[PDB]
Design an enzyme around this catalytic site. Structure first.
Site, PDB file in Angstrom:
ATOM      1  N   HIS A  88       0.787  -1.236   0.000  1.00 13.12           N
ATOM      2  CA  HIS A  88       0.000   0.000   0.000  1.00 13.12           C
ATOM      3  C   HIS A  88       0.823   1.293   0.000  1.00 13.12           C
ATOM      4  O   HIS A  88       0.395   2.280  -0.573  1.00 13.12           O
ATOM      5  CB  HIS A  88      -1.066  -0.022   1.118  1.00 13.12           C
ATOM      6  CG  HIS A  88      -2.069   1.086   1.022  1.00 13.12           C
ATOM      7  ND1 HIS A  88      -1.942   2.267   1.724  1.00 13.12           N
ATOM      8  CD2 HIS A  88      -3.209   1.194   0.300  1.00 13.12           C
ATOM      9  CE1 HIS A  88      -2.971   3.055   1.449  1.00 13.12           C
ATOM     10  NE2 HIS A  88      -3.755   2.424   0.591  1.00 13.12           N
ATOM     11  N   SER A 109       1.236  -0.194  -6.659  1.00 10.83           N
ATOM     12  CA  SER A 109       1.596  -1.308  -7.525  1.00 10.83           C
ATOM     13  C   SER A 109       2.644  -0.849  -8.542  1.00 10.83           C
ATOM     14  O   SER A 109       2.745   0.361  -8.817  1.00 10.83           O
ATOM     15  CB  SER A 109       0.347  -1.822  -8.230  1.00 10.83           C
ATOM     16  OG  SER A 109      -0.213  -2.935  -7.554  1.00 10.83           O
ATOM     17  N   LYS A 123     -12.307  -4.491 -13.853  1.00 16.69           N
ATOM     18  CA  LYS A 123     -11.272  -5.331 -14.498  1.00 16.69           C
ATOM     19  C   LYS A 123     -11.082  -6.655 -13.740  1.00 16.69           C
ATOM     20  O   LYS A 123     -11.074  -7.740 -14.340  1.00 16.69           O
ATOM     21  CB  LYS A 123      -9.935  -4.571 -14.578  1.00 16.69           C
ATOM     22  CG  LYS A 123      -8.821  -5.209 -15.431  1.00 16.69           C
ATOM     23  CD  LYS A 123      -7.975  -4.117 -16.176  1.00 16.69           C
ATOM     24  CE  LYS A 123      -6.655  -4.648 -16.776  1.00 16.69           C
ATOM     25  NZ  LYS A 123      -5.534  -4.625 -15.771  1.00 16.69           N
ATOM     26  N   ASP A 124     -10.966  -6.549 -12.410  1.00 14.51           N
ATOM     27  CA  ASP A 124     -10.707  -7.703 -11.563  1.00 14.51           C
ATOM     28  C   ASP A 124     -11.885  -8.627 -11.607  1.00 14.51           C
ATOM     29  O   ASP A 124     -11.769  -9.798 -11.240  1.00 14.51           O
ATOM     30  CB  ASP A 124     -10.497  -7.311 -10.114  1.00 14.51           C
ATOM     31  CG  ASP A 124      -9.296  -6.447  -9.905  1.00 14.51           C
ATOM     32  OD1 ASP A 124      -8.713  -5.939 -10.890  1.00 14.51           O
ATOM     33  OD2 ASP A 124      -8.945  -6.246  -8.727  1.00 14.51           O
ATOM     34  N   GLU A 133       1.646 -34.087  -4.856  1.00 13.09           N
ATOM     35  CA  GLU A 133       0.872 -33.045  -5.504  1.00 13.09           C
ATOM     36  C   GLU A 133       1.675 -32.323  -6.585  1.00 13.09           C
ATOM     37  O   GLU A 133       2.895 -32.127  -6.477  1.00 13.09           O
ATOM     38  CB  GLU A 133       0.369 -32.026  -4.469  1.00 13.09           C
ATOM     39  CG  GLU A 133      -0.668 -32.561  -3.578  1.00 13.09           C
ATOM     40  CD  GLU A 133      -1.580 -33.529  -4.294  1.00 13.09           C
ATOM     41  OE1 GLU A 133      -1.313 -34.760  -4.239  1.00 13.09           O
ATOM     42  OE2 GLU A 133      -2.571 -33.074  -4.907  1.00 13.09           O
TER      43      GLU A 133
END
Ligand SMILES: CCCCCCCCCCCCCCCCCC(=O)OC[C@H](COP(=O)(O)OCCN)OC(=O)CCCCCCCCCCCCCCCCC
Ligand SMILES: CCCCCCCCCCCCCCCCCC(=O)OC[C@H](COP(=O)(O)OCCN)OC(=O)CCCCCCCCCCCCCCCCC
Ligand SMILES: CCCCCCCCCCCCCCCCCC(=O)OC[C@H](COP(=O)(O)O)OC(=O)CCCCCCCCCCCCCCCCC
Ligand SMILES: CCCCCCCCCCCCCCCCCC(=O)OC[C@H](COP(=O)(O)O)OC(=O)CCCCCCCCCCCCCCCCC
Ligand code: HEM
Ligand code: HEM
Ligand code: HEM
Ligand code: HEM
Ligand code: HEM
Ligand SMILES: COc1c(O)c(C)c(C/C=C(\C)CC/C=C(\C)CC/C=C(\C)CC/C=C(\C)CC/C=C(\C)CCC=C(C)C)c(O)c1OC
Ligand SMILES: COc1c(O)c(C)c(C/C=C(\C)CC/C=C(\C)CC/C=C(\C)CC/C=C(\C)CC/C=C(\C)CCC=C(C)C)c(O)c1OC
Ligand SMILES: CCCCCCCCCCCO[C@@H]1O[C@H](CO)[C@@H](O[C@H]2O[C@H](CO)[C@@H](O)[C@H](O)[C@H]2O)[C@H](O)[C@H]1O
Ligand SMILES: O=C1C(O)=C([C@H]2CC[C@H](c3ccc(Cl)cc3)CC2)C(=O)c2ccccc21
Ligand SMILES: O=C1C(O)=C([C@H]2CC[C@H](c3ccc(Cl)cc3)CC2)C(=O)c2ccccc21
Lengths: 93, 57, 248, 385, 126, 385, 93
Positions: free
Chosen positions: D202, D206, D228-229, D272
């Site tokens: 924060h 970004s 968008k997300d 896995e």
């Protein structure tokens, strides 16, 4: 609120950047445009450009890796076959 | 979606939170209607219902 | 890995249920239960399947009530404090042939026959591999393969030496509906029945799956549209540069 | 001022989700942390709802999950979602970590941001492992044996640690029961940690697919990226729907529908998928202590990345020699994974070994080399003298 | 953080040796093309990461109208980048333009710093 | 600046625990939230450590706790601490809520601060109840029947809610198992909530035993109160040690070492002490729907307190008529509690009824009355004309 | 950091209060004092003052409550005794 540590981001009106002069922007309401702004037609001449400009940087490395994969794969099927049990008794011990 | 057929109902505003939920309520029956039909048909003969039919005991 | 230790790859038979839109063949399931009941029940538990669960799938309410009560489950002690049996209820789980792990092995040269309820998932290939191990007992253990005392050969098992002798021999089951009680028809069924056993939810699961995707797909495409709209001002946004007279 | 800004609670909400100033230029790669938070929420909801019918006693354990499968209403949907979801969690998280390498997010001022995600990634492996040990099939009981046994590698005390950690002679009952309890605990630790992770994010905001400064053309997360997300979200659910209803085990090992048995390890030990590349690296080392160390080091080494990147720009975007090896790295990592699935046979072992080398060499060697070269191409590739 | 003062050392050397220069620069030229960046109106000094003191000594110092220049490009960059496109071919920065406009100050400041570093730990022999 | 101020993480640490400016004058009453956070931590540690050996199946349930008692190393210490601690949690929390009434903390700007604590208090009752239902003794199975049954009071749907909520015909097995799972979940919700609670606290800072402004004589929490708080802490542990080792059940009901039995309610239904005053209020109402409502209302009513306080000063400190009724309120509340322990016999029922009246009347009636009077005493008790 | 909502607290040097002039404070190092500053002696004449000034405000209400307690308590023991079963059959139904 105590002192905060300086960073390289601020909020609007003190975002942090240099002091803009000269640029002049223009835009138009999302209502005021063709629904389907620019689809198909010439917007796809780029779905091959956004491809071209890069593919090599993936393909070349994918290649190196996929052929190396196939090789020792083949090589393994061999030494665990009839025709191979020879080389096995040697390579493996 | 045609500008006439939409604007009729909703003039020049979106859908309204409650109308949404209403549609949702309706859609949810209308859908589970269709899809459960198309599926019971697509698998005709195969359903235990179709097999309950012939088989007797 | 030698192709003998691996086991031969079972082939892609074309089952009634393969595909995104395919309910089981319940008629087929119905057959498998008989093929189950008469043949393999002799050795194999099916403990995580309950009588009621059959109802509406392979049978009808009494049809399963009938089967149910043919066995005496344990039941709460009388007023004195001494045991008692009782027939079954639909509330019950189809009882194993053996009273414990030991007698299962005693009756099989010390082999522990796998509970089958989960078999079609506890194996690679599953439906196919089940079919193939059942229709793949060839006549003789291939030139050179020397087989232990009380063990058979199967290309589909790993290292062929399977402690289960062949068990499908045409017609040994009297197919109640009246179908070719073969071995590749005796088998294809117990497979389709054993499929169910490990995946009962099946037909609903693709049903709901259908809905989920149709709705979810539409949302995806719908979401996309919306996005270009809200972005439309930023996408078609266009700047211009005009250097400014040097005075500040 | 507005209320959402003024309120003690809504001000956070606003400043991290509505009014946040994002670089104008960031693409769908950046949708990963969003989709990351979504999995963590899918993990925690479906988990709790399932726990209501789960028993962590070594007897009832394997069965109770079958219970959730055969009996609990929508219970199968509860399981296939928990399990398939854990995978998508791991894919998306790799793609999120990828993105961070490629655009060189790990790079100052974002080091702490980066470092914390390395802690998260560690906690997510720890978490998902325990959740596996809770099915108590075959892969479960033996998975749980080896991880407990990594601790023997510790000088002297190592065996005892393992004994403790087992609560007895073997991975027994006091084991699956603590593995259930620790499976409950930890996801809240991830969430705790996701918060510091988002705090670091924060105070710097970004980066961008251009590795230049954002501060000249910011736009607010609402309503662009929120919308968008939402595109990546639905798409995410779609593929997840696809697996969950149609391919529920196209991602799991059939050995796990077999009740765990402490006397008999299977003979197909594939772990896995998201774990494989480490299994590979582990095996690659014919020494116990060293092998362990090198497996852990395979993740830690990720912390040098901001020092060994010698460059003068953040981002492979304008970086041909960097792009190239970056995809050797990706592709190595996948191969390494293929190696994990195959038997310790030839040439596989030796292939495994070479990839492992390539792996650490990429952080430790290729990168600082290439990037230093790449600085010098950038100088002489223009200037006069 | 490989140093510019250090890139100078290496890249000057290579530029001087007519031996090296003929070998290297063709590639380097080939490189600063394949980068793609002059197609987003970007000069190379634009790309240099700024979140560090030296560059903030080096941008505070950078002549006004020069910073307005940087700016427009950096915004032009982002703008285009987000349009998922490349500029009109004739808007691209041309090979003569990609000049190290910033590099003096970066160097100017690097120098200044290394000096102070030294002068903070300067020892004494008696 | 200093590092602890500059760091993204340590700045919070500093600003809520080191550099926080507290009123210079606050006394040991204020040590309660501190000691509150300490219990929540004691609850969560000992809980998890116990869960590792707990089974939430209706059979093994009662026994497994005996298991934790007879078998797990220090396991008895695990239990007596969990249980006695829950009580001290509740005492300390009442004293914390007391303090808030007396000095009129609930009072603007601190409303939200206050309100949230009402949510916390609710979640702590919800939490501790479930933790009780997890022993599965007698008091447990019948406690769990009645609380589940409070929902029938809901028009129409009410029975079904209860059936759902039960997962079957009775408080059966799908019940104790969800009650265990929800017992895990919720304490993290309290902690979540303690954070917003501390955020509200933070933007206004603590009040004072003088109900005037702090902003003229602040001192920093480190090192005064950090050390002050350490005194109440040890003292807290001491009495808790006293119970835990010497009086482990001087606070529990013996009916709970009896395995729960769904056919036979006991004939001594005393519920937990911190719960009693509500049991009382509940019983006081010869109508089912109304009785429920009034029990819940006994806690909600706590939200009007900032409106009904009509005063012009925060604090009973300079308030004789206010002090007086404030201790009638405290003492009523304790009596109400004594009423909860006794049988629905006479005059107890009628005493119960009167206290209940006194209870709500104190918020709704006494307080706004008295405080309005008290304003007027403050005027005429000085001025000329 | 976006705008923050105004309150009635700030941090040091902007704490929020009014603009102090005139007061002059004095203190002395915690090292520079008698260990046991003022204990017993006259520090206890207050452990009876801090008591007096308040006790009534607790005792009076505690009193009212404890006697009311004892009363119906007594009253209950009665009507459930032999000597009481009479009144019971009346008060109770
Ligand atoms: C839980 C919060 C319940 C509550 O009663 O909070 C009331 C709060 C009051 O609004 P507020 O901004 O505090 O007014 C100024 C006074 N300082 O109003 C709010 O804080 C509403 C905030 C909603 C919380 C959503 C967070 C997710
Ligand atoms: C988890 C944190 C691990 C980590 O690597 O954080 C490194 C951090 C770096 O210090 P930092 O203040 O971020 O330096 C300026 C750069 N923005 O250093 C720290 O943040 C140390 C903080 C300790 C966290 C304690 C919180 C309780
Ligand atoms: C912790 C273990 C080590 C790290 C693990 C990483 C695991 C492997 C990552 C999994 C693969 C994820 C995709 C990786 C590619 C990143 C995408 C990208 O950087 O796009 C930029 C890259 C170029 O970006 P542009 O130059 O700005 O357009 O896009 C591509 O070239 C296509 C990527 C196709 C894949
Ligand atoms: C949610 C249910 C309703 C609320 C629950 C409250 C439950 C009862 C609270 C339990 C008793 C806690 C102690 C209450 C006394 C508060 C102490 C106090 O205010 O001291 C000031 C009060 C006077 O303060 P001063 O005037 O500033 O010295 O101190 C006393 O008078 C002595 C208190 C002895 C108890
Ligand atoms: C529809 C009929 C039957 C089916 C589908 C079936 C299926 C299977 C399967 C899937 C296995 C697991 C081996 C593996 O995949 O690893 C197995 C093993 C075994 N079966 Fe059967 N079975 C049937 C009937 C019988 C009968 C009739 C008997 C004996 C009377 C029997 C005795 C055994 C024994 C002793 C094993 C242990 C083999 C080993 O450990 O490798 N089964 N069977
Ligand atoms: C619980 C798992 C995670 C969550 C919820 C999460 C969340 C986020 C979010 C929401 C963002 C902003 C959107 C974006 O930039 O993608 C972000 C970015 C970032 N993450 Fe994470 N992340 C997770 C895992 C990781 C891991 C495992 C790492 C590193 C090992 C990491 C390091 C970073 C860095 C350096 C950025 C900045 C990216 C940029 O500059 O655009 N994160 N993360
Ligand atoms: C980061 C979050 C989580 C991850 C990555 C994770 C991972 C896993 C995995 C891989 C499994 C085995 C799935 C299978 O193959 O069946 C599992 C099982 C399980 N998990 Fe989680 N888990 C998470 C959170 C939670 C939470 C919050 C709960 C709350 C109770 C939970 C409860 C369970 C239960 C009861 C099982 C056994 C049933 C089942 O296996 O599906 N999990 N977990
Ligand atoms: C998990 C339970 C709780 C925790 C951890 C907690 C924590 C704290 C802390 C640390 C403080 C600062 C020290 C103090 O003033 O006592 C405080 C004060 C306060 N609390 Fe809580 N508390 C809790 C419960 C409650 C409840 C149940 C309420 C109301 C129903 C409440 C309302 C308040 C108020 C209004 C203050 C301000 C007191 C003042 O002005 O001095 N709290 N709390
Ligand atoms: C606010 C926090 C908590 C409260 C108020 C609380 C309350 C309680 C209570 C009253 C009991 C019954 C104690 C007894 O009489 O034996 C109990 C039991 C139990 N609690 Fe908690 N609990 C809390 C947190 C936790 C947490 C985080 C766990 C983590 C697993 C946990 C696990 C257990 C277990 C396993 C039992 C049964 C064993 C026992 O009764 O001592 N509790 N809880
Ligand atoms: C800087 O750039 C950013 C950016 O900052 C953000 C925030 C986003 C958007 C991303 C996010 C909002 C991600 C946030 C991630 C989280 C918030 C994850 C946190 C999740 C948790 C902490 C999980 C906690 C969950 C619970 C407590 C739910 C559990 C409750 C239950 C199970 C109740 C059910 C029980 C019963 C009995 C009913 C971006 O896209 C972005 O890119 C441009
Ligand atoms: C304004 O005035 C104040 C004031 O602000 C403060 C803060 C204090 C001091 C008070 C505090 C510091 C209280 C703070 C309360 C909390 C921080 C409570 C929060 C507690 C939690 C959120 C619990 C979370 C706990 C965990 C995650 C621990 C669980 C971990 C476990 C169990 C690991 C163990 C497991 C294994 C397998 C080993 C005052 O005294 C004060 O008065 C003057
Ligand atoms: C997490 C679970 C989520 C569940 C599903 C959520 C569904 C959300 C539905 C919300 C609908 O909310 C709806 O939004 C539209 C905008 O599109 C609002 O419309 C509003 O702004 C639009 C412009 O966009 C104006 O035309 C209109 O006059 C105004 O009312 C409307 O007030 C509200 O009715
Ligand atoms: O032998 C193993 C083994 O070695 C792993 C591996 C996988 C990667 C694990 C791992 C642990 C920690 C980290 Cl940080 C990364 C990977 C370590 C155990 C397994 O997962 C496994 C599963 C089932 C049966 C056997 C095994
Ligand atoms: O009948 C009850 C009963 O009524 C309560 C009561 C106690 C207070 C509870 C309560 C629930 C919610 C709140 Cl917000 C407050 C108190 C309600 C149940 C019990 O705790 C109890 C315990 C054991 C056996 C029987 C009983």
């Amino acid at each position: 609120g105590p002192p905060s540590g300086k960073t390289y981001m601020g909020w609007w009106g003190h975002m942090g950047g240099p002091k803009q002069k000269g640029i002049t922007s223009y835009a138009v309401s999302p209502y005021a445009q063709k629904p389907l702004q620019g689809i198909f037609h010439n917007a796809v001449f780029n779905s091959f450009r956004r491809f071209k400009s890069q593919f090599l940087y993936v393909l070349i490395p994918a290649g190196i890796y996929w052929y190396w994969w196939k090789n020792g794969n083949e090589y393994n099927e061999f030494l665990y076959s009839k025709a191979g049990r020879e080389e096995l008794e040697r390579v493996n011990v | 979606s045609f500008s006439s057929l939409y604007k009729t109902f909703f003039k020049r505003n979106a859908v309204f939170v409650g109308t949404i939920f209403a549609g949702a309520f309706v859609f949810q029956t209308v859908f589970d209607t269709a899809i459960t039909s198309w599926y019971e048909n697509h698998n005709k003969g195969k359903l235990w219902k179709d097999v309950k039919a012939r088989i007797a005991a | 890995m030698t192709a003998a230790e691996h086991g031969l790859h079972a082939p892609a038979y074309a089952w009634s249920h393969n595909g995104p839109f395919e309910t089981f063949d319940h008629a087929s399931i119905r057959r498998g239960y008989q093929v189950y009941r008469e043949v393999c029940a002799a050795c194999h538990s099916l403990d995580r399947v309950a009588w009621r669960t059959l109802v509406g799938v392979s049978h009808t309410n009494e049809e399963v009530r009938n089967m149910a009560e043919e066995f005496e489950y344990d039941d709460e002690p009388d007023e004195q404090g001494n045991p008692k049996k009782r027939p079954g209820k639909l509330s019950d789980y189809i009882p194993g042939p053996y009273p414990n792990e030991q007698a299962a092995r005693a009756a099989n040269q010390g082999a522990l026959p796998p509970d089958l309820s989960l078999i079609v998932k506890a194996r690679h290939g599953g439906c196919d591999y089940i079919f193939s191990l059942l229709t793949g007992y060839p006549d003789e253990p291939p030139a050179g393969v020397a087989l232990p005392p009380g063990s058979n050969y199967n290309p589909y098992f790993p290292g062929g030496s399977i402690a289960m002798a062949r068990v499908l021999f045409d017609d040994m089951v009297e197919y109640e509906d009246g179908t070719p009680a073969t071995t590749s028809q005796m088998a294809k069924d117990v497979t389709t029945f054993l499929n169910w056993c490990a995946e009962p939810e099946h037909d609903e699961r693709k049903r709901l799956g259908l809905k989920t995707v149709i709705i979810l797909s539409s949302l995806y495409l719908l979401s996309i549209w919306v996005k270009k709209f809200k972005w439309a001002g930023i996408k078609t946004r266009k700047f211009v540069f005009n250097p400014p007279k040097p005075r500040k | 001022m507005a209320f959402r800004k003024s309120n003690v609670y809504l001000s956070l909400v606003n400043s991290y989700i509505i009014d946040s100033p994002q670089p104008s230029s960031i693409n769908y790669w950046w949708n990963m942390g969003s989709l990351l938070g979504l999995c963590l929420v899918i993990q925690i909801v479906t988990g709790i709802f399932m726990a209501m019918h789960y028993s962590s006693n070594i007897e009832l354990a394997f069965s109770s999950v079958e219970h959730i499968m055969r009996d609990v209403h929508n219970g199968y949907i509860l399981r296939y979602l928990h399990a398939n979801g854990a995978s998508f969690f791991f894919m998306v998280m790799f793609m999120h970590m990828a993105k961070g390498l490629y655009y060189g997010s790990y790079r100052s001022p974002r080091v702490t941001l980066w470092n914390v995600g390395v802690i998260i990634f560690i906690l997510t492996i720890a978490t998902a492992f325990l959740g596996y040990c809770c099915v108590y099939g075959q892969m479960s009981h033996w998975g749980a044996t080896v991880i407990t046994n990594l601790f023997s590698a510790i000088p002297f005390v190592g065996n005892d640690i393992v004994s403790w950690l087992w609560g007895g002679f073997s991975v027994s009952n006091p084991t699956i029961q603590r593995f259930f309890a620790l499976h409950y605990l930890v996801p809240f630790i991830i969430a705790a940690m996701v918060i510091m992770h988002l705090m670091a994010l924060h105070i710097h905001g970004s980066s961008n697919p251009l590795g230049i400064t954002g501060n000249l053309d910011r736009i607010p997360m609402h309503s662009y990226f929120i919308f968008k997300d939402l595109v990546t979200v639905f798409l995410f659910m779609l593929i997840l729907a696809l697996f969950v209803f149609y391919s529920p085990n196209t991602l799991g090992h059939p050995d796990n529908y077999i009740p765990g048995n402490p006397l008999v390890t299977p003979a197909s030990i594939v772990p896995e998928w998201y774990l494989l590349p480490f299994y590979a690296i582990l095996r690659s080392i014919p020494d116990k202590l060293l092998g362990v160390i090198t497996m852990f080091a395979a993740i830690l080494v990720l912390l040098v990345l901001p020092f060994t990147d010698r460059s003068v720009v953040r981002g492979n975007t304008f970086k041909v020699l960097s792009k190239f090896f970056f995809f050797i790295f990706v592709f190595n990592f996948v191969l390494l994974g293929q190696i994990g699935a195959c038997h310790v046979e030839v040439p596989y072992v030796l292939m495994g070994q070479i990839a492992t080398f390539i792996y650490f060499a990429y952080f430790l060697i290729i990168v600082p080399v290439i990037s230093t070269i790449e600085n010098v191409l950038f100088y002489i590739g223009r200037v006069n003298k | 953080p490989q140093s510019f003062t250090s890139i100078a050392r290496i890249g000057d050397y290579i530029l001087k040796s007519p031996v090296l220069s003929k070998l290297c620069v063709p590639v380097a030229n080939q490189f600063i093309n394949l980068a793609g960046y002059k197609k987003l109106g970007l000069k190379f000094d634009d790309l240099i990461a700024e979140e560090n003191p030296i560059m903030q000594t080096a941008l505070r110092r950078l002549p006004e109208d020069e910073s307005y220049a940087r700016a427009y490009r950096i915004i032009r960059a982002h703008q285009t980048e987000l349009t998922h496109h490349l500029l009109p071919r004739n808007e691209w920065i041309k090979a003569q333009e990609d000049v190290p406009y910033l590099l003096p100050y970066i160097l100017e400041a690097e120098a200044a710093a290394k000096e102070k570093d030294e002068l903070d730990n300067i020892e004494v022999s008696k």
